[PDB]
């Protein structure tokens, strides 16, 4: 809810108006990579032991 | 009341005055507002049980 005044005369009185503020979410990716040789595959698995 | 300081000499002889008044309010009656309306009026109250 947002403030009011109450505020002397006829003027129309303060419409109060009294929504749900909603918002738009983002989105990003944020992504990385790491290395993995050849080698340290057939390790790793057991391939070449 | 008012005081008064008595004094010598060819001054007029101070006399006592007294400061009798009366005001009146004011009013300025304040107004705030609201608003229902239709759906949300007959939700409210026996009409949706």
Same mark, same amino acid.
């Given at each position: 809810?947002? /403030?009011? %005044? =109450? $505020? #002397? !005369? /006829?003027?129309? *009185?303060?419409?109060? *108006? ?6 738009? %979410? #983002? $989105? $990003? @990716? +944020?992504? @990385? =990579?790491?290395? +993995? =040789?050849?080698?340290? %595959? @057939?390790? +790793?698995? !057991?391939? @070449? +032991?």
């Amino acid at each position: 809810h947002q /403030p009011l %005044i =109450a $505020r #002397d !005369g /006829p003027h129309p *009185v303060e419409q109060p *108006v009294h929504n749900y503020m909603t918002k738009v %979410i #983002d $989105r $990003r @990716a +944020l992504n @990385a =990579a790491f290395s +993995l =040789a050849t080698e340290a %595959i @057939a390790l +790793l698995t !057991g391939e @070449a +032991l």
